[PDB]
Amino acid sequence: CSPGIWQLDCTHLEGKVILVAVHVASGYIEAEVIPAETGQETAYFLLKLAGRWPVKTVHTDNGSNFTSNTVKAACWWAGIKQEFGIPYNVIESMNKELKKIIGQIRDQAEHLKIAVQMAVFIHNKKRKGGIGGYSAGERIVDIIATDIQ
Amino acid sequence: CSPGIWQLDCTHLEGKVILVAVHVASGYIEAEVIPAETGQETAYFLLKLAGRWPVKTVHTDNGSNFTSNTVKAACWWAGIKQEFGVIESMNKELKKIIGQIRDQAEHLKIAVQMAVFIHNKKRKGGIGGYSAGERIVDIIATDIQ
């Protein structure tokens, strides 16, 4: 998988909206509770993501927030190719994993948005079986560093 | 400078609050307009940062948002050394870039992210070498061995 490829989508929990991005090659994720499932919030999130990593292509759903003029303008400005594919054709399974972790730690936080970030942390730091090997957070840095050469 | 060391501070622009984090060894930054200069918002930002990078130490000032029990608890939970005893120069640089592109966006928060992008992708003189975003990835990857 190319080091520049991400998948993005929204999932829902406690009547709130969570935007989730996955770096396909590594399994690293970033997620944010957003106030509304709008193009403005999606574009804001995409600009944050693009300033952090060398984002070349984002695969997204085809809902109005992802097809909005403001997401298109954000992608154009940041040099991101947006890909939609066949309508309703990694991200979904990641929604499920994220929600599982959130459930595991939900009582450890007072507000859902804090729990979301605790769950992202747990996901990105996790080593398979808890012993050695690499975490997703290490894999994304290794892949990107190697691509830079 | 150690790969795990960050500085965090708040700066102000257009009467709004911008939280700024700098990775000291690389010059890479993350920044966001926050609705209030509170411990809750600071802890949310710190937990985001900590989930992305191997954060070992954050240097902060001693204002009420950074000494709040919520920020202390976030650092404890994430295993981060919070030290109260580069970030200023970075506040100014960020503000300079924001000024350069401010008319390109409708809201300050979007302009802030455009400015972070410009900063993190910038090559010295615009020609070759590495950017701050490449430097942090190189430093961390190397530290992993």
Side-chain angles (χ1 to χ4, degrees), chain A residues 28-33 40-41 43-44 47-48 50-55 77-79 105 108 111 113-114 116-122 124-125 134 137-142 144-146 148-149, chain B residues 28-33 40-41 43-44 47-48 50-55 70 77-79 101 104 107 109-110 113-118 120-121 130 133-138 140-142 144-145:
Chain A
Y28 164 92
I29 70 179
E30 313 196 347
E32 291 248 19
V33 173
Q40 189 182 338
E41 289 299 321
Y44 184 48
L47 290 173
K48 288 170 182 182
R52 181 141 54 234
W53 310 107
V55 179
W77 185 89
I105 55 75
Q108 302 294 298
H111 311 277
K113 64 190 297 189
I114 297 294
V116 169
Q117 300 310 330
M118 296 170 77
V120 170
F121 180 107
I122 289 163
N124 285 343
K125 305 299 182 177
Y134 294 114
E138 287 170 349
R139 285 193 297 275
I140 182 169
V141 168
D142 177 63
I144 302 304
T146 298
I148 300 164
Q149 315 173 9
Chain B
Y28 165 93
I29 70 179
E30 313 193 347
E32 292 182 352
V33 173
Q40 189 182 335
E41 289 300 322
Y44 180 69
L47 287 172
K48 289 166 54 187
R52 176 144 52 241
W53 309 107
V55 179
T70 306
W77 186 88
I101 54 76
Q104 300 296 300
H107 307 102
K109 62 190 295 189
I110 299 291
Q113 299 308 326
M114 295 168 76
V116 168
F117 180 106
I118 289 164
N120 284 344
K121 306 301 182 178
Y130 292 112
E134 288 169 351
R135 283 193 297 275
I136 181 169
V137 169
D138 178 64
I140 302 304
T142 297
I144 299 165
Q145 318 294 352

Side-chain angles (χ1 to χ4, degrees), chain B residues 1-6 23-26 56-57 139-140 143:
Chain B
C1 186
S2 158
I5 308 308
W6 296 73
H23 179 252
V24 179
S26 67
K56 291 297 183 185
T57 301
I139 291 163
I140 302 304
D143 192 45

